[PDB]
Design an enzyme around this catalytic site. Structure first.
Site, PDB file in Angstrom:
ATOM      1  N   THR H   1     -10.795  -2.976 -40.533  1.00  0.00           N
ATOM      2  CA  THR H   1     -11.657  -1.924 -41.182  1.00  0.00           C
ATOM      3  C   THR H   1     -11.974  -1.993 -42.676  1.00  0.00           C
ATOM      4  OG1 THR H   1     -10.919  -0.336 -39.640  1.00  0.00           O
ATOM      5  CG2 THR H   1     -11.647   0.648 -41.595  1.00  0.00           C
ATOM      6  N   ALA H  49      -6.244   2.730 -34.137  1.00  0.00           N
ATOM      7  CA  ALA H  49      -7.378   3.510 -33.637  1.00  0.00           C
ATOM      8  C   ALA H  49      -6.910   4.753 -32.887  1.00  0.00           C
ATOM      9  CB  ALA H  49      -8.246   2.654 -32.728  1.00  0.00           C
TER      10      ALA H  49
HETATM   11  C1  LIG Z   1     -10.303  -2.642 -39.131  1.00  0.00           C
HETATM   12  C2  LIG Z   1     -11.328  -3.117 -38.070  1.00  0.00           C
HETATM   13  C3  LIG Z   1      -9.031  -3.436 -38.805  1.00  0.00           C
HETATM   14  O1  LIG Z   1      -8.367  -3.638 -40.063  1.00  0.00           O
HETATM   15  C4  LIG Z   1      -9.957  -1.078 -38.953  1.00  0.00           C
HETATM   16  O2  LIG Z   1      -8.659  -0.787 -39.507  1.00  0.00           O
HETATM   17  C5  LIG Z   1     -10.009  -0.518 -37.519  1.00  0.00           C
HETATM   18  C6  LIG Z   1     -10.077   1.000 -37.606  1.00  0.00           C
HETATM   19  C7  LIG Z   1     -10.511   1.602 -36.405  1.00  0.00           C
HETATM   20  C8  LIG Z   1     -10.587   2.997 -36.422  1.00  0.00           C
HETATM   21  C9  LIG Z   1     -11.002   3.715 -35.306  1.00  0.00           C
HETATM   22  C10 LIG Z   1     -11.349   3.037 -34.145  1.00  0.00           C
HETATM   23  C11 LIG Z   1     -11.283   1.647 -34.107  1.00  0.00           C
HETATM   24  C12 LIG Z   1     -10.868   0.931 -35.226  1.00  0.00           C
HETATM   25  N1  LIG Z   1      -8.789  -0.863 -36.801  1.00  0.00           N
HETATM   26  C13 LIG Z   1      -8.775  -1.684 -35.747  1.00  0.00           C
HETATM   27  O3  LIG Z   1      -9.751  -2.253 -35.266  1.00  0.00           O
HETATM   28  C14 LIG Z   1      -7.394  -1.869 -35.162  1.00  0.00           C
HETATM   29  C15 LIG Z   1      -6.677  -2.958 -35.924  1.00  0.00           C
HETATM   30  C16 LIG Z   1      -5.402  -2.975 -35.350  1.00  0.00           C
HETATM   31  C17 LIG Z   1      -5.050  -3.958 -34.425  1.00  0.00           C
HETATM   32  C18 LIG Z   1      -3.783  -3.950 -33.854  1.00  0.00           C
HETATM   33  C19 LIG Z   1      -2.868  -2.960 -34.202  1.00  0.00           C
HETATM   34  O4  LIG Z   1      -1.626  -2.959 -33.644  1.00  0.00           O
HETATM   35  C20 LIG Z   1      -0.608  -3.177 -34.636  1.00  0.00           C
HETATM   36  C21 LIG Z   1      -3.220  -1.972 -35.119  1.00  0.00           C
HETATM   37  C22 LIG Z   1      -4.482  -1.984 -35.691  1.00  0.00           C
HETATM   38  N2  LIG Z   1      -7.490  -2.224 -33.741  1.00  0.00           N
HETATM   39  C23 LIG Z   1      -6.977  -1.417 -32.801  1.00  0.00           C
HETATM   40  O5  LIG Z   1      -6.435  -0.335 -33.027  1.00  0.00           O
HETATM   41  C24 LIG Z   1      -7.115  -1.918 -31.375  1.00  0.00           C
HETATM   42  C25 LIG Z   1      -5.729  -2.208 -30.795  1.00  0.00           C
HETATM   43  N3  LIG Z   1      -7.764  -0.857 -30.606  1.00  0.00           N
HETATM   44  C26 LIG Z   1      -9.087  -0.860 -30.405  1.00  0.00           C
HETATM   45  O6  LIG Z   1      -9.841  -1.733 -30.831  1.00  0.00           O
HETATM   46  C27 LIG Z   1      -9.593   0.340 -29.593  1.00  0.00           C
HETATM   47  N4  LIG Z   1     -10.833   0.037 -28.871  1.00  0.00           N
HETATM   48  C28 LIG Z   1     -10.875  -1.299 -28.200  1.00  0.00           C
HETATM   49  C29 LIG Z   1     -11.914  -1.308 -27.154  1.00  0.00           C
HETATM   50  O7  LIG Z   1     -11.667  -0.233 -26.239  1.00  0.00           O
HETATM   51  C30 LIG Z   1     -11.967   1.022 -26.872  1.00  0.00           C
HETATM   52  C31 LIG Z   1     -10.947   1.187 -27.935  1.00  0.00           C
END
Ligand SMILES: *[C@@](C)(CO)[C@](*)(O)[C@H](Cc1ccccc1)NC(=O)[C@H](Cc1ccc(OC)cc1)NC(=O)[C@@H](C)NC(=O)CN1CCOCC1
Ligand SMILES: [Mg+2]
Lengths: 244, 240, 233, 231, 250, 222, 235, 211
Positions: H1, H49
């Protein structure tokens, strides 16, 4: 079930009084008279033991005057056993405060805490209240010398001079008459003993029927000393004031 | 645990324990609250049956809940301490979680809710206490004066009295207090509060306590001499 | 969390036209030690279900008791306990599957792999698998442990898909199972020659065969094998 | 008299008055009828209103796809007991992949009501229930009393003036039991049965409430213009 | 089930009386006479072994009980209540004192703990007060010899000499005439036997009287040697023979 | 040490049309290099015109679906047989998932159906409850193989109109159900070729206002 | 004494029946449901002229689409309102939607019989719960301390209830407008009230689909009172 | 993000990208990282997320009850504090949240940074996420208080673009919001693919890239 046998100790009368508190006060009115008098340079605590015996070991006996800490003492009127429960709680509270703040507990704070415990037994739990009235004599660096009283209702008030137990009506009138604001400890000692001598139900007031204590700044320089009078010392002060 | 239902309905739809708690309030010393244009005054009766009292250390009738709110009461003294303690804890809890001091209306609502809870909880009796809660909201110059009672109902008042002979002083306030033009100054507000207590009190010596609360946490308790000057002026005008 | 101590190896099974067959050897291994030689790992429940269990034997005995208690409990205040309201294979399985998943979710699993074989009220074949993780699946052939790797390939040559089930007779199905058990005896180091076999048919009911042995084994060719490469004598 | 203060007290003749008083609440309640054949089971309920501006209190509650009941007495108590049945029906499905037997559902209600009759502090349930259902042994009708007694019946009725409908069903026993593969005729017999308990008032469109369950029929409730057919 | 008596069974009456405590004291009045006398070099406690049946072995029933090596107890009133109080008193002496300070409690503090237990039965939920008055005699290094009475209310008083139970009023009068501050232990035992004879009707001998003392240390009763500071228990129960010997010089 | 999680493979795919929605998934169930079943259903009709699939660890997937179906049942009991909208189901599923934030359901969940305007809807979830509505979404083992293909053939990404040379995009023309099912079958046929956990069979559930329909297609069994 | 959950020989819970007597002593509250909205009105009944009447809060918002009026021991209503508000918002959290008026009312009524020896007694207050949802439209419910709730086209609770209900019996019809309903509540309140009805001792409110739940200003109500007086003097 | 927000004379701008990642794989490119708490309150999402979404929606329900009880809209300071205290219970348990509570209250425009670590900071300018470091450069150099709404919206948009370009885990599209005293206003979804080329041509920036 069990409801059948419940006396319901924590309820109002139609007149808005707490039955058990009122009846506890009735109990206390038959207890030995205890008097507290506050002077400019100290506090006096005097109390009458109830119809004693010649075979009672007086020098090791304690039914009226108790020590809460080095600065604070109490005179009891009512059930002694009930009073000791509360006294030990108060002693612990004083030590908790000292451990927490590294300062001796202010008198009022200790009084409020005990009075709150008494209040609890009148509002919840379904238990009988403590049949005890205290006179608190104490000193701290905020208000100096202080006299308080608490009763089974958990209500407490401050006093210049006060009595609890038997014949308080008569005793309070005598104190109200002879008390003055510029009074000293030695004078207050005399007033306390004279008041007991006139209000007592006994034929004559003797050393073996009394407990006596003073809280004086009459300690070497800026500090406070508690003196629980010994039987021989009560005998001497009775002669000095001209009662025996 | 002791679970007994003490506060219950009777055939005629009354909760006697709550009504008997009001009788305890009726027995209590008189308390009065009057709000002016830019202030609120809390007057309290002190029964003169108790002399040889140490007025320095004796629990004062008006209690600060926070720097901007005060609480006076009528009824059981020991019961009032429990409500005041709870109110004070909630006031700090509100500052701690929401970063604003309580509004007078919020604090009153909390205290009233506690009183209500004790009318339908097992093993407990109602508080034998009615309160007058007064003050000013943060960053507000509108005076606030609320009343509570054992049942748990609360409401706002232009002026109100509770306790013994409250019927008489309420009668006085109803004819003397004008809503269109309330006490414009502190003097006028205090004078009216003292006048109202003089209908009931007996002697105007150490029997009347007065506490003035002004905006922005400006709270002060009047002394014996200051009050005695009001008592003097009132009766001198009365001799006519 | 634990580790399995006394263990049972493969349980194998398959569907055929009128019912199901299930089999398992009679060995209770203690690591590499072939400790207990008389262990029954097929446990019938009523006359319409057989539960085959592999893995930890102490947990198997616990499950065996749960099933025994289940039958007792079902009979309580139940006039139709031996008729319409009798225990079905699907009821027995779902109960075990509930228990297995709950236990894994408390991080204290029953260290087993279970196959519930039976025939339903309507005559339908029931064959479903469940394990320590609570993972469930159904197939025309099912096998646990080594059986999954060696038996399934052989049994799937007989019943490769659902449409092959009506074409498969009990004689052919039993032949395939018995052959698979021989192969497992050749190749599984924690298997025994002695085994039990159970057939649950919708017509002939439950047939439980004990004290079976692997026979017609090929070993003669071993005499010709000499050394590990260059050795001739 | 002296022995009716709580549920934990037998009278000198061995009676439990609090349970009997709870039974009295059912008699004050509006009439409801239950009956069954070999293929279907039917509930018919006369709903009651507070006044002309008010709605007609619902009497029938669904417990599962294959089971439900009608109530008479304290409605909140029916909500508690029906919620319990819903959970038990649901436990049977989730754990055993098994539809709960109606007979076993009755045994569970009996045991739940009984605990309230033997312990101090609590009170008996103040409602009577008629449970219908279709399970592996066909159609079923149960009558629940808050004393704990549960009874399997061909037909019955509970509530005010329920004796009239019960007598009718006792005469019609041989006829309505044979109504197999005909839901409308079985409901007709139920509507005709509940009609024997009516005085002054008659069955209107928002007054009548009907429910049915059967062989290839999930438990469904009919209200409003859906029951105008049977008036 | 559950104990649903969470409310007090002892309550103040309109006159201020705590009925159950008064009634408990009435039960104590009906009880067999027991007494205690304090000497300069010891304390004596005594009572009558009122045997319920001659077939009963009265030796098995001990009215006088050891609480600590230097503290003993006797009662008047309900025997079963006394027995459980002795069990609790013995235990509290360890849990609230000996396991903390590594030594046995002084008489006054053990008495205080017993008193607390009896007070709680006067205020706690669903219980009646204990129907006994205790006389507790004991010795400790800094307070010397002492004798305490404990009542059903939980109140306790120190005595030079006293009596409780059936003929206490007469017995206390008898003790007032005989007691002085120069009594030796043997003199106190003699006075105890004289006082006790007045309240006893039937047989008066070592088998019908139970008597114990708090006196000198008994190294012969310690059970081991090798530690100079451990000199043995001051509590000693007099034998049947030892009582009879003093009844000849009576 | 006991590992409470596992990987049962499989891949799922949800596509939303203008007035319909599909939810597809292969029927293969696996552990490591073994096949458990060649036909083990993974996409379910949950009621109220909603289809659901929880892909990854089958034991957790079965439990979640079982709970959601139960949530639908109680939604009817508690709210007068009211129909559970797809947006309401998605929010409910978030709370089912996050109720195990510290011991997650190890599954990627997709639901499909129709929104309250009658248009096709697909919702995608992560294992701990983050959801979002989408037009096109593949989940599971071969999700990375399929999604780029759908970006290209469903949303016309990196596709421009000839002659303009990158100045004008390809317009977003809606797809029919027959066109969508072709993309689904080609997606799974391509995934089956290059992913070892994908194969055996393909079961598609199509949702319209008329109800829920099924379609089954064989896949390579190697 | 006697159990709190005791049945009378007639088959009624003593305590529930006694709480209904307390509600009869309460100030009047009236609700009228129409196809253009639901109107809620209450008698404030100040005990003294010094009491600032605007602080009397007997009409209350539960959600944007649900309102509530009370009568009886009004202090008992606060925990019921709190529960209702929590239930309404919690359902919005779990299901991303407004909650049905019936479901909300059912949630409130589930508290009612949770008393015994849970709270120590039934509630001493009746509630008129008015609202709107997409499924069943504009609705008015009467929630009692028995745990029972009836839906109503129009309903009056409190001291002048039976007199007001008889008046609502004659006046209500299915084609009532919102303006007509407003005047009708004011008319009936004025009839049963002890003191003379004005904008300070009576309060109106309504719930519409568009604007949601709104408590009326004293200036707005004053005009409706003046409009009422003129139309009654018109014949 | 990449997310950012800043206070200025005309309220507060709130911008965010739309990429979601699962390792190197781009899971989604259309995610709402801005949360609609109430018509006068916004919340950003960065990190987990699921965590951000769940706790902020929980916050939103908490804020609504507040309005019902108190007849008054919650302050930005109190809202941010409820979140902070809620996540502080689960400190060290594995939560991953980086959020900004943006709104307008009685004190004017308000902006608080709140994370799972326990920080709660009031500030005029914030940016959180893997691409925050790229965005700060553009903000700090161009940020003023006397910024027009048009210029302010562009700054927040341009700052996201800067990060989307460089950061591999940021991109997709830009979501814009403007919070006024009359409530928040959504200013659209902007595809970075198209936006990049546009900005390159009009601004002249990104000279090193060929187009
Ligand atoms: C940027 C893209 C990553 O640094 C940002 O922080 C986003 C923020 C965000 C906020 C709301 C919704 C979606 C994204 N974060 C992510 O993309 C996170 C990064 C992450 C990865 C792994 C983690 O575990 C330690 C923690 C953070 N990704 C996720 O949370 C990911 C696991 N979930 C999703 O992408 C949820 N989506 C995927 C597709 O199905 C629908 C939901
Ligand atoms: Mg493949």
């Amino acid at each position: 079930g069990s409801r059948r046998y419940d006396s319901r100790t924590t309820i109002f009368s139609p007149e808005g009084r707490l039955y058990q508190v009122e009846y506890a006060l009735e109990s206390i009115s038959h207890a030995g008279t205890a008097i507290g008098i506050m002077a400019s340079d100290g506090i006096v605590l005097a109390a009458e033991r109830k119809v004693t015996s010649t075979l009672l070991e007086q020098d090791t006996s304690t039914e009226k005057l108790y020590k809460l800490n080095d600065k604070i003492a109490v005179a009891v009127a009512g059930l002694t056993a009930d009073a000791e429960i509360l006294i030990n709680t108060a002693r612990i509270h004083a030590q908790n405060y000292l451990k927490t703040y590294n300062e001796d507990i202010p008198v009022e704070i200790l009084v409020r805490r005990l009075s709150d415990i008494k209040q609890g037994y009148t509002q919840h739990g379904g238990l009988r209240p403590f049949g005890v009235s205290f006179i608190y004599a104490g000193y701290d660096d905020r208000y100096g010398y202080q006299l308080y009283t608490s009763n089974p209702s958990g209500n407490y008030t401050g006093w210049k001079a006060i009595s609890v137990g038997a014949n308080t009506s008569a005793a309070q009138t005598l104190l109200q008459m002879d008390y003055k604001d510029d009074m000293k400890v030695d004078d207050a000692i005399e007033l306390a003993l004279k008041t007991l001598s006139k209000t007592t139900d006994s034929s004559a007031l003797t050393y073996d029927r009394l407990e006596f204590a003073t809280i004086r700044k009459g300690a070497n320089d800026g500090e406070v000393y508690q003196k629980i009078f010994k039987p021989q010392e009560i005998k001497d002060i009775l002669v000095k004031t001209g009662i025996t | 645990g002791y679970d007994r239902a003490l506060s219950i309905f009777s055939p005629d739809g009354h909760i006697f324990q709550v009504e008997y708690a009001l009788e305890a309030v009726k027995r209590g010393t008189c308390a009065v609250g009057v709000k002016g244009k830019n202030c609120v005054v809390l007057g309290c009766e002190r029964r003169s049956t108790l002399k040889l009292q140490d007025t320095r250390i004796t629990p004062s009738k008006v209690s600060k809940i926070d720097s901007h709110v005060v609480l006076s009461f009528s009824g059981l003294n020991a019961d009032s301490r429990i409500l005041i303690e709870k109110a004070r804890v909630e006031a700090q809890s509100h500052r701690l979680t929401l970063e604003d001091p309580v509004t007078v209306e919020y604090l009153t609502r909390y205290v009233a809710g506690v009183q209500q809870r004790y009318t339908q909880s097992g093993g407990v009796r109602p508080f034998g206490v009615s309160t007058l809660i007064a003050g000013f909201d943060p960053r507000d110059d509108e005076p606030k004066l609320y009343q509570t009672e054992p049942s748990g109902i609360y409401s706002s008042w232009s002026a109100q009295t509770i306790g013994r002979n409250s019927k008489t002083v309420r009668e006085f306030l109803e004819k003397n207090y004008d809503r269109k033009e309330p006490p414009a100054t502190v003097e006028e507000c205090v004078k009216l509060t003292v006048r109202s207590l003089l209908e009931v009190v007996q002697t105007g010596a150490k029997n009347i306590e007065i506490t003035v609360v002004k905006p922005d946490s400006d709270i002060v308790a009047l002394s014996s001499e200051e009050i005695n000057q009001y008592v003097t002026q009132i009766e001198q005008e009365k001799q006519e | 969390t634990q580790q399995p101590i006394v263990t049972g190896t493969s349980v194998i099974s398959m569907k055929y036209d009128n019912g199901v067959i299930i089999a398992a050897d009679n060995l209770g291994s203690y690591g590499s030690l072939l400790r207990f030689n008389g262990v029954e790992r097929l446990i019938p429940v009523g006359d319409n279900t057989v539960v085959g269990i592999s893995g930890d034997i102490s947990d198997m005995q616990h499950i065996e008791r749960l099933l025994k208690d289940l039958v007792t409990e079902n009979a309580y205040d139940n006039p139709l306990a031996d008729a319409e309201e009798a225990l079905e294979p699907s009821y027995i399985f779902e109960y075990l599957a509930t228990v297995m998943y709950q236990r894994r979710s408390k991080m204290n699993p029953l260290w087993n792999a279970i196959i519930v074989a039976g025939v339903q009220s309507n005559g339908d074949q029931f064959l479903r698998y469940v394990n320590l993780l609570g993972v469930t699946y159904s197939s025309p052939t099912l096998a646990t442990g080594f059986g999954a790797h060696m038996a399934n390939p052989l049994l799937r040559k007989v019943v490769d898909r659902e449409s092959d089930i009506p074409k498969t007779t009990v004689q052919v199905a039993e032949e395939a199972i018995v052959n698979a058990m021989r192969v497992l005896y050749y190749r599984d180091a924690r298997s025994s020659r002695n085994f039990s076999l159970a057939i649950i048919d919708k017509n002939t009911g439950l047939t439980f065969k004990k004290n079976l042995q692997v026979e017609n084994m090929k070993w003669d060719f071993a005499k010709d094998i000499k050394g590990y490469g260059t050795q001739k004598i | 008299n002296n022995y009716d203060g709580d549920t934990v007290t037998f009278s000198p003749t061995g009676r439990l008055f609090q349970v009997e008083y709870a039974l009295e609440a059912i008699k004050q309640g509006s009439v409801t009828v239950g009956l069954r054949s070999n293929t279907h089971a039917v509930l018919v309920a006369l709903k009651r209103n507070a006044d002309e501006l008010s709605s007609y209190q619902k009497k029938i509650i669904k417990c599962d796809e294959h089971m439900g009941l009608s109530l008479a007495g304290l409605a909140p108590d029916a909500r508690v007991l029906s919620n319990y049945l819903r959970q038990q029906c649901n436990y049977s499905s989730l754990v055993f992949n098994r539809k709960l037997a109606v007979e076993r559902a009755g045994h569970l209600l009996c045991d739940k009501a009984q605990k309230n009759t033997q312990s101090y502090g609590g009170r008996p349930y103040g409602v009577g229930l008629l449970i219908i259902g279709y399970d592996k042994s066909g159609a079923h009708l149960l009558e629940f009393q808050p004393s704990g007694n549960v009874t399997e019946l061909y037909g019955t009725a509970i509530g005010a003036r329920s004796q009239g409908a019960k007598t009718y069903l006792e005469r019609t026993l041989d006829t309505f039991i044979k109504i197999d593969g005909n839901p409308d005729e079985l409901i007709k017999a139920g509507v005709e049965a509940i009609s024997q308990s009516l005085r002054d008032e008659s069955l209107t469109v928002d007054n009548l409430s009907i429910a049915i369950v059967g062989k290839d029929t999930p438990f469904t409730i009919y209200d409003g213009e859906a029951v105008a057919k049977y008036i | 089930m559950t104990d649903r008596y969470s409310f007090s069974l002892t309550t103040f009456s309109p006159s201020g009386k705590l009925g159950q405590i008064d009634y408990a004291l009435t039960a104590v009045k009906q009880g067999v006479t027991s007494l205690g006398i304090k000497a300069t070099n010891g304390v004596v406690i005594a009572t009558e072994k009122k045997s319920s049946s001659p077939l009963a072995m009265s030796e098995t029933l001990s009215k006088v009980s050891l609480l600590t090596p230097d503290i003993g107890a006797v009662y008047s009133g309900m025997g079963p209540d006394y027995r459980v109080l002795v069990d609790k008193s013995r235990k509290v002496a360890h849990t609230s004192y000996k396991r903390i300070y590594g030594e046995y409690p002084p008489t006054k503090l053990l008495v205080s703990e017993v008193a607390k237990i009896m007070q709680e039965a006067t205020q706690s939920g669903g219980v009646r007060p204990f129907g006994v008055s205790l006389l507790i005699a004991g010795h400790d290094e800094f307070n010397g010899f002492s004798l305490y009475q404990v009542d059903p209310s939980g109140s306790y008083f120190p005595w030079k000499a006293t009596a409780i139970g059936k003929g206490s009023v007469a017995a206390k009068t008898f003790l007032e005439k005989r007691w002085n501050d120069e009594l030796e232990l043997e003199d106190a035992i003699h006075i105890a036997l004289l006082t006790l004879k007045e309240s006893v009707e039937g047989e008066f001998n070592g088998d019908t009287i139970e008597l114990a003392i708090i006196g000198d240390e008994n190294p012969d009763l310690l059970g081991y040697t090798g530690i100079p500071t451990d000199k043995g228990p001051r509590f000693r129960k007099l034998t049947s023979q030892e009582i009879n010997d003093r009844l000849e010089a009576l | 040490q006991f590992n409470p999680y596992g990987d049962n493979g499989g891949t799922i795919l949800g596509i939303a049309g203008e007035d319909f929605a599909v939810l597809a998934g292969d029927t293969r169930n696996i552990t490591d290099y073994s096949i458990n079943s060649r036909y083990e259903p993974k996409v379910f009709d949950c009621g109220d015109n909603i289809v659901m699939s929880a892909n990854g660890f089958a034991a957790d997937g079965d439990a979640l679906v079982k709970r959601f179906k139960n949530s639908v049942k109680w939604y009817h009991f508690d709210h007068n047989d009211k129909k559970l909208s797809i947006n309401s189901a998605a929010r409910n599923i978030q709370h089912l998932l996050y109720s195990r934030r510290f011991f997650p359901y190890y599954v990627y969940n997709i639901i499909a159906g129709l929104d309250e305007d009658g248009k096709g809807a697909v919702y995608s979830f992560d294992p701990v409850g983050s959801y979002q509505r989408e037009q096109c979404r593949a989940g599971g083992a071969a999700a990375s193989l399929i999604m780029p293909f759908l970006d290209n053939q469903v949303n016309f990404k990196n596709q421009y109109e000839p002659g303009t040379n990158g100045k004008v995009k390809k317009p977003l023309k809606y797809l029919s159900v027959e066109e969508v099912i072709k993309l689904v079958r080609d997606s799974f046929t391509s995934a089956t070729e290059r992913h070892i956990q994908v194969g055996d069979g393909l079961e598609i559930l199509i949702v319209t206002k008329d109800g829920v329909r099924k379609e089954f297609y064989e896949l390579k069994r190697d | 004494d006697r159990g709190v959950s005791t049945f009378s020989p007639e088959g009624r819970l003593f305590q529930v029946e006694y709480s209904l007597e307390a509600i009869k002593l309460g100030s009047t509250a009236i609700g009228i449901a129409t196809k253009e909205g639901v109107v809620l009105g209450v008698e404030k009944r100040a005990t003294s002229p010094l009491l600032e009447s605007d602080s009397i809060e007997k009409i209350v918002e539960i959600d944007r689409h649900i309102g509530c009026a009370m009568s009886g021991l009004t202090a008992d209503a606060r925990s019921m309102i709190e529960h209702a508000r929590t239930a309404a918002v919690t359902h919005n959290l779990y299901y991303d939607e407004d909650i049905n008026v019936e479901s909300l009312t059912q949630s409130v009524c589930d508290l009612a019989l949770r008393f015994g020896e849970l709270m120590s007694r039934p509630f001493g207050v009746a509630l008129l719960i008015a609202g709107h949802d997409a499924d069943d439209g504009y609705q008015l419910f009467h929630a009692e301390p028995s745990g029972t709730f009836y839906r109503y086209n129009a309903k009056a609770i409190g001291s002048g209830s039976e007199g007001a209900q008889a008046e609502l019996l004659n006046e209500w019809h299915s084609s009532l407008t919102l303006k007509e309903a407003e005047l009708l509540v004011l008319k009936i309140l004025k009839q049963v009230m002890e003191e003379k009805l004005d904008e300070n001792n009576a309060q109106l409110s309504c719930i519409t689909k568009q604007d949601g739940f709104k408590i009326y200003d004293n200036e707005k109500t004053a005009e409706l009172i003046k409009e009422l007086k003129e139309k009654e003097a018109a014949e | 993000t990449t997310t950012l927000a800043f206070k200025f004379r005309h309220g507060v701008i709130v911008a965010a990208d739309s990429r979601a990642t699962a390792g190197a794989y781009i899971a989604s490119q259309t995610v709402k990282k801005v949360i609609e708490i109430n018509p006068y309150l916004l919340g950003t999402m960065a990190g987990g997320a699921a965590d951000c979404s769940f706790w902020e929606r929980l916050l939103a329900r908490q804020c609504r009850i507040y309005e019902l009880r108190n007849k008054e809209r919650i302050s930005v300071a109190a809202a941010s504090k409820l979140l902070a205290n809620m996540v502080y219970q689960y400190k060290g348990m594995g939560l991953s949240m980086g959020t900004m509570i943006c709104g307008w209250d009685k004190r004017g425009p308000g902006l608080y940074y709140v994370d799972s670590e326990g920080n709660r900071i009031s500030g005029a300018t914030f940016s959180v996420g893997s691409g925050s470091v790229y965005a700060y450069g553009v903000l700090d150099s161009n940020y003023k208080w006397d910024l027009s709404v048009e210029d302010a919206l562009y700054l927040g948009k341009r700052s996201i673009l800067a990060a989307a370009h460089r950061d591999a885990y940021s991109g997709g599209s830009v979501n814009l919001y403007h919070v006024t005293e009359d409530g928040w206003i959504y200013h659209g979804n902007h595809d970075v693919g198209e936006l990049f080329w546009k900005v390159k041509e009009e601004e002249g920036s990104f000279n090193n890239v060929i187009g």
